[PDB]
Design a protein around this ligand. Structure first.
Ligand SMILES: Cc1cc2nc3c(=O)[nH]c(=O)nc-3n(C[C@H](O)[C@H](O)[C@H](O)COP(=O)(O)OP(=O)(O)OC[C@H]3O[C@@H](n4cnc5c(N)ncnc54)[C@H](O)[C@@H]3O)c2cc1C
Ligand code: FES
Ligand code: FES
Ligand SMILES: [Ca+2]
Lengths: 1297, 49, 98, 49
């Protein structure tokens, strides 16, 4: 038949016309209206769409539960299954323990990842009601969070395993009997036999095959019929590569494809068996069998460790990985190296093959005939004298794409160390899984010894050579990894031979080599959060300085919190899709919309012509709404398709064909320098006498540093709904933005109506981080236009690939420095020339450069100093604000040359930094005085509490006893100036009402993006009014309640809005005091009613401007900042000198946040910021083609910190007894200042590399280069050794921007 | 009265903190708000008319 | 607004109070989250009560713009407003009358 | 008000009124109402929070 029947949160769903292209995520959100489940990526990498599936499993005869990515599950695969979403487990009227604990532990900030994380934890508990710590962390390999820094999530959930920020004792206990019943109808139906189904969509036919016979018949009659099992590959091909397979067959139900049979040679897995099942039976087997039989099994397990998360492995089949035939398959090299036996069948045929180089004859091809399917894989037992290793090196450990992956097998002649068989297989080194078939034969009958090591390495370097233009680039690193992995396997085999009593023949391992062969393990995490208790006398209703959880955390855990795309659609609402250039610089010669017009539901294509008033936008008016005549980057918005649904808008957008004539392109910083292409003139700060400073200097060091940019990766992408009101050009927009004011202005200018017609509303964002300070308007304006033109509501939420391409990022920096210093380490002179890559449009680029220059000192007094900046104007997407706003780039350069000062002097870095540090009362290079200079206390507390000195010695000892792992340890300070560099933006407003029931409705210009701003403002108002927080509510931010607001940015928003709120509250109190005087006890509610019935106004505005600001670049005078933030971080790392991987062992932070408004939110901000910094300096890398096309457009290639990335031991202390009386209730701003402290990890890695280069380099250069990010590639390449030596030897995959 | 437009209300629940927005043909936004809030048992600050 | 032309009268009042054309002033709606604790539109009194409200709010805005008016006595409304904004002067005000 | 476009998920309400000037309500039978397509619920005093 053809009805699709399944259950969602216990309720039956009967879909009479299921479209095979419909995902579960779209069905839940758009058909059932259940918007708890989020779109974060559409790629399986972020887990925001995680839900649970339950079914009666017929082969195991019981109810099972597993997690899936709803974004990749076709509803047509879900017949007779039961779906549970975040809504299904509880709500704010009755929270599930999982929801309660993540909320109360400060585990939810912006909240957009919270449902998905809730569902991962919930599923684990349905399978294992008493997990281990380890099982809890493993449950989130498939979930990303950009805000929290992960620590609080794990800490709250650790309570399920085996003063204070939260109280685990108040957490309600888990009663498993109260979980939702398995739908009884589904239990009745597992009796009746399952028959074949057919679903017919707009373009795709889906057959759910019930028997092997039906599947073979179909494949014989129609070999075009595309097998879909888990859809974790096919989903990506359909969504992102625009592949259409018009006939799909799903064979997941067929018993024969799902069986597990134990034979004499090994274990056979039906090809549709999920990787989660492979994992569980292989773990059983390796637990119970002898080690000598399980070498291959453990090799597969080692690969599956680092293979996506629970959500993917639940439905991703072994067969699917094998047939996908990706060059970077982690499993095919292992199956190939082990000669795994594959059984293939077609209607009335059957053959067996052993995987070898012939199985994979070409790019994404196999040995299968069009009409054949893979039936099963036998994973073999290992034999006596047979040893196996598997290896994978990626950018990040968990859920990443392998650079190089490998399976390796040796078999020895019995009683000997002589090689009978050798098999070295690799992914990531060609367009397929290859075997080193020229190298390994030469090794047969050789003894396992030093010369076999040298021969295999020479052979590998020659056989596996790489084309400069090779997909992926990184040719030195990749080649170095093939040798380095062989070396580990060589040492591992030496050891395993030892364990078989053959130590005398092959030799003992040198004990300093033993750490080389260890399989990755992490110590158990240990966290500390230290903060100051409020005074004893402080009222219990005064929450200022108390760890109040985010006001919306319960609703975020429950999926009830509304983000923009969760807002229900009007019946007449249309969808918009942007159409962008595929060229970096070109003339638009013509546009053809023929194909677009044929897509059902197509409404129109908007272009520059349709703009009613002005096509000129952007902060400096140099941007088009829609491209006119030329495109100036890949991602330049040319126009917008409007259609009924997002799917029809995507299809129609595909049918907009643009013809281009290329123009000369300026891509790189170098390109811009050569071409004199800059935004405005040179920016400069200079003090003292450079020529004299450099003369007096004992030593002068020159160098360069390159710093890569950064994608914000807010889990909620840019989104606008524009609702036209049909009168007087009036329109209301619902926008995920940090800048309602510019959104409103830009929409009004484009439409040619006054600002008073346009209302911009922001309830909340799922992250912003600066990326939504300006660049959100590029979506907002287009949707506004669509809405004006149609007279209908219009909506656009960007897909992650679109958002990453269009909206730009942190500015890449290039710096050229020259520092002069004494033998004592005292620096006397500094000159730095900074260049940034601004892209397409000026946007905030010049202000970002200013801030970098304001922070080129970091913490250090430099008497003679000159800094310049130039912003490069290039044919790239325009770069913008990112948390830090040029500060991190400026300060990393300062610390980089400072690192080289310490090493040149032969002095401890610690002492060199402290010596150079500013003192209380000193002036900066920009002549601002440092008062309330708290940095030395932060430093002394941090050095002491981290036990930095005793750890130095442990690091030195480790480095002397280990050749192929090295530790590093560094302590880094920071000074961060607080206030917008444009003075007049340091203003904020509020509006308050008190209703006649006494309840207070408050609003201010600040927007909530997960930083806990509304929470803080409620804390503030509650103190100012002397009523409980419970009587005060903030609903949203809107241009029609507070006008002319600055962006939520520069960390300043609590300072500004706090003052505004306080002043509004003071006006209300003044008006109430006569009533208070007459009834000094009678409650608040009586004073309010008394004022009302005396006709006294109970509404007030409030406003604040930061006083005494205004710096001149001409006179180097006036204060740019109101005050500074200070902090210090000490970080320890352990690098793997053979792979470039590393562990973040421990980090200790002391942060001056004045008297914290909320220590829970503030420690959250310190951790979140630190972890974004960690990404910036060690994991996050964007890659562009030489023609300026962004390659890195999703989490598959862009690797933000994962749960498993954070420091294993993570201590945060807020400085005690440091009131900052010039900000609201003596607080300081917290959002941006801590990010640069992840620097400490970068400089720890640099120390570890220096120790590696002393161990193994020849006359290795002393001041070696480490650019940011310090990725595994850069770490590995810098650890020069015997292996990098034999791998060293202009059209290529990517260019340095 | 025979106002040519009869009485009419759209109420839109926002799903958080009892928040609700009403579009009403009324001369009295305050009593509308007060009566709705009391009936539901939520503070006036949750209810917009 | 129920047909009695109240918004029209309030825009006329504001335009006189501020000394700008009616064309630069807009009323979009009435809502409890912009002005709380309102009396019903009744007793014929609404232009009297709200006119005073509006007038006072406009007086507050004028008071705030007057230094900018003094230093640019002919320069247009727009220049005074933009000067006030870039001097971080509040351009929002309540008004009330009993 | 009624000119405002409906949300896709928007529902319609109709009041049920007394046909008696002064009486006890002895019972309410909702059988027939429940058979009308698209019927969601009948609110009465018990539904008031
Ligand atoms: C977030 C994420 C992370 C990932 N990480 C990794 C990783 O680290 N390493 C890695 O190797 N892979 C990784 N993958 C790829 C993933 O393992 C594969 O997508 C998966 O194994 C494919 O199985 P499937 O059942 O989803 O395949 P489907 O997508 O359903 O099918 C894929 C291909 O196999 C064919 N096929 C399936 N079954 C058969 C059969 N019995 N006979 C013949 N043809 C068949 C289909 O026609 C299709 O061509 C990742 C994917 C995602 C989404
Ligand atoms: S939206 Fe499904 S994994 Fe990201
Ligand atoms: S709180 Fe996790 S992505 Fe924002
Ligand atoms: Ca720019």
């Amino acid at each position: 038949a053809d009805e699709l029947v399944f259950f969602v949160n216990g309720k039956k769903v009967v879909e009479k016309n299921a479209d095979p292209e419909t995902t579960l995520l779209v069905y839940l959100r758009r058909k059932l209206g259940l918007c708890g489940t989020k779109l974060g990526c559409g790629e399986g990498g972020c887990g925001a769409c995680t839900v649970m599936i339950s079914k009666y499993d017929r082969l195991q005869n019981k109810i099972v539960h597993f997690s899936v990515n709803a974004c990749l599950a076709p509803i047509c695969s879900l017949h007779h299954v039961a779906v549970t979403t975040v809504e299904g487990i509880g709500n704010t009227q009755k929270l599930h323990p999982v929801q309660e604990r993540i909320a109360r532990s400060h585990g939810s900030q912006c909240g957009f990842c919270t449902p998905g994380i809730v569902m991962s934890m919930y599923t684990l508990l349905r399978n294992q009601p008493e997990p281990t710590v380890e099982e809890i962390e493993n449950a989130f390999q498939g979930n990303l969070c950009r805000c929290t820094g992960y620590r609080p999530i794990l800490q709250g959930f650790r309570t399920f395993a085996k003063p204070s920020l939260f109280n685990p004792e108040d957490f309600k206990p888990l009663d498993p009997t109260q979980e939702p019943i398995f739908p009884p109808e589904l239990l009745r139906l597992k009796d009746t036999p399952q028959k074949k189904l057919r679903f017919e969509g707009e373009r795709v036919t889906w057959i759910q095959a019930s028997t092997m016979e039906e599947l073979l018949d179909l494949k014989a009659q129609h070999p075009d019929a595309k097998l879909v099992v888990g859809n974790t590959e096919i989903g990506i091909e359909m969504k992102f590569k625009n592949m259409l397979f018009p006939l799909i067959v799903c064979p997941a139900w067929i018993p024969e494809l799902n069986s597990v049979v134990h034979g004499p040679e090994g274990i056979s897995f039906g090809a549709s068996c999920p990787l989660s099942l492979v994992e569980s039976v292989l773990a059983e087997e390796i637990a119970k069998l002898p080690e000598q039989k399980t070498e291959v099994f453990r090799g597969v397990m080692e690969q599956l460790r680092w293979f996506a998360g629970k959500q993917v492995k639940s439905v991703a089949s072994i067969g699917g990985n094998i047939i996908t035939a990706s060059p970077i398959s982690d499993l095919n090299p292992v199956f190939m190296a082990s000669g795994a036996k594959l059984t293939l069948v077609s209607r009335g045929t059957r053959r067996t093959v052993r995987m070898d180089h012939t199985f994979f004859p070409g790019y994404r091809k196999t040995l299968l005939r069009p009409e054949e399917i893979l039936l099963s894989i036998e994973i073999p037992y290992s034999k006596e004298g047979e040893f196996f290793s598997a290896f994978k090196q990626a950018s990040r450990r968990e859920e990443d794409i392998a650079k190089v992956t490998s399976g390796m097998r040796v078999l020895f002649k019995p009683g000997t160390i002589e090689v009978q068989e050798l098999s070295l297989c690799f992914g990531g080194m060609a367009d397929r899984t290859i075997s080193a078939l020229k190298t390994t034969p030469k090794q047969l009958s050789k003894s396992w010894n030093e010369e076999l090591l040298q021969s295999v390495c020479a052979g590998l370097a020659e056989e596996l050579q790489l084309a400069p233009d090779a997909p992926g680039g990184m040719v030195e690193f990749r080649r170095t990894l093939t040798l380095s992995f062989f070396f580990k396997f060589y040492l591992t085999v030496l050891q395993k031979l030892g364990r078989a009593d053959l130590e005398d023949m092959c030799g003992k391992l040198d004990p300093t080599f033993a750490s080389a062969t260890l399989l990755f393990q992490k110590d158990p995490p240990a966290n500390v959060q230290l903060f100051q208790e409020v005074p004893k006398d402080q009222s219990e209703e005064d929450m200022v300085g108390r760890p109040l959880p985010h006001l919306a955390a319960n609703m975020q855990a429950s999926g009830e919190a509304v983000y923009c795309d969760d807002i229900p659609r009007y019946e007449n609402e249309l969808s918009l899709r942007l159409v962008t250039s595929t060229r970096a610089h070109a003339k638009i010669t013509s546009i053809d919309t023929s194909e677009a017009k044929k897509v059902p539901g197509f409404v129109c294509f908007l272009t520059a012509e349709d703009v009613p008033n002005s096509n000129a936008t952007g902060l400096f008016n140099d941007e088009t709404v829609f491209a006119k005549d030329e495109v100036t980057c890949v991602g330049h918005i040319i126009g917008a398709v409007v259609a009924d649904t997002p799917e029809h808008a995507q299809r129609a957008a595909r049918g907009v064909k643009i013809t281009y004539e290329d123009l000369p392109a300026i891509i790189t910083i170098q390109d811009a320098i050569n071409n004199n292409s800059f935004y405005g003139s040179e920016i400069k700060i200079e003090k003292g006498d450079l020529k004299k400073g450099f003369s007096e200097a004992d030593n002068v060091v020159s160098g360069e540093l390159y710093i890569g940019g950064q994608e914000h990766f807010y889990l909620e992408t840019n989104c606008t709904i524009a609702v036209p009101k049909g009168e007087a050009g009036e329109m209301e927009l619902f926008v995920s933005t940090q800048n309602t004011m510019k959104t409103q202005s830009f929409v009004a200018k484009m439409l040619g109506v006054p600002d008073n017609r346009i209302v911009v509303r922001v309830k909340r964002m799922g992250g912003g981080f600066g990326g939504k300070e300006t660049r959100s308007t590029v979506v907002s304006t287009a949707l506004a236009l669509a809405a004006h033109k149609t007279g209908r509501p219009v909506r656009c939420m960007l897909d992650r690939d679109e958002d990453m391409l269009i909206t730009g990022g942190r500015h890449p920096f290039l710096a050229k420095y020259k520092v002069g210093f004494m033998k004592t380490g005292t620096v006397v002179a500094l000159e730095v020339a900074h260049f940034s890559n601004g892209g397409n449009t000026e946007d905030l680029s010049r202000s970002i450069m200013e801030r970098a220059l304001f922070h080129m000192d970091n913490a250090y007094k430099i008497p003679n100093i000159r800094g310049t900046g130039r912003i490069c104007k290039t044919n790239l997407p325009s770069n913008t604000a990112f948390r830090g706003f040029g500060g991190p780039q400026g300060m990393l350069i300062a610390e980089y040359w400072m690192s080289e000062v310490a090493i040149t002097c032969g002095l401890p870095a610690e002492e060199v930094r402290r010596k150079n540090m500013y003192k209380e009362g000193d002036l900066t290079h920009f002549n601002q005085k440092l008062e309330g200079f708290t940095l030395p206390r932060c430093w002394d507390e941090c050095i002491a509490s981290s036990q930095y000195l005793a750890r130095k010695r442990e690091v030195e000892k480790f480095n002397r006893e280990n050749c192929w792992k090295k530790r590093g340890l560094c302590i880094i300070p920071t000074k961060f100036g607080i206030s917008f560099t444009l003075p007049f933006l340091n203003q904020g407003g509020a509006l308050v009402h008190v209703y006649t029931d006494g309840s207070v409705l408050l609003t201010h210009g600040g927007t909530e993006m997960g930083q806990g701003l509304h929470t803080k403002m409620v804390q503030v108002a509650s103190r100012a009014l002397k009523i409980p927080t419970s009587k005060i509510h903030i609903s949203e931010t809107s241009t029609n309640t507070v006008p002319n607001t600055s962006p939520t940015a520069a960390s300043a928003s609590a300072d500004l809005n706090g003052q505004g709120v306080y002043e509004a509250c003071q006006t209300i109190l003044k008006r109430l005091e006569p009533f208070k005087k007459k009834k000094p006890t009678g409650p608040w509610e009586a004073w309010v009613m008394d004022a009302y019935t005396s006709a006294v106004s109970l509404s007030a505005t409030g406003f604040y401007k930061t006083p005494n600001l205004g710096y001149s670049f001409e006179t180097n005078s006036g204060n740019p900042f109101h005050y500074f933030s200070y902090g210090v971080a000490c970080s320890e790392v352990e690098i793997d000198c053979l792979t470039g991987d590393h562990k973040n062992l421990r980090t200790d932070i002391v942060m001056d946040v004045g008297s914290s408004l909320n220590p829970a939110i503030d420690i959250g901000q310190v951790e979140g910021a630190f972890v974004q910094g960690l990404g910036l300096f060690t994991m996050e890398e964007l890659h562009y083609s030489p023609e300026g096309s962004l390659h890195t457009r999703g989490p598959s290639t862009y690797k933000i910190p994962a749960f498993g990335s954070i420091p294993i031991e993570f201590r945060v202390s807020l400085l005690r007894d440091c009131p900052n009386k010039r900000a609201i209730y003596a607080s300081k701003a917290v959002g941006e200042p801590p990010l640069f402290l992840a620097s400490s990890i970068f400089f720890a890695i640099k120390d570890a590399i220096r120790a590696a280069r002393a161990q193994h380099g020849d006359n290795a250069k002393q001041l070696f280069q480490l650019d940011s990010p310090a990725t595994p590639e850069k770490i590995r390449n810098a650890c020069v050794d015997q292996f990098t030596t034999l791998c060293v030897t202009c059209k290529s995959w990517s260019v340095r921007i």
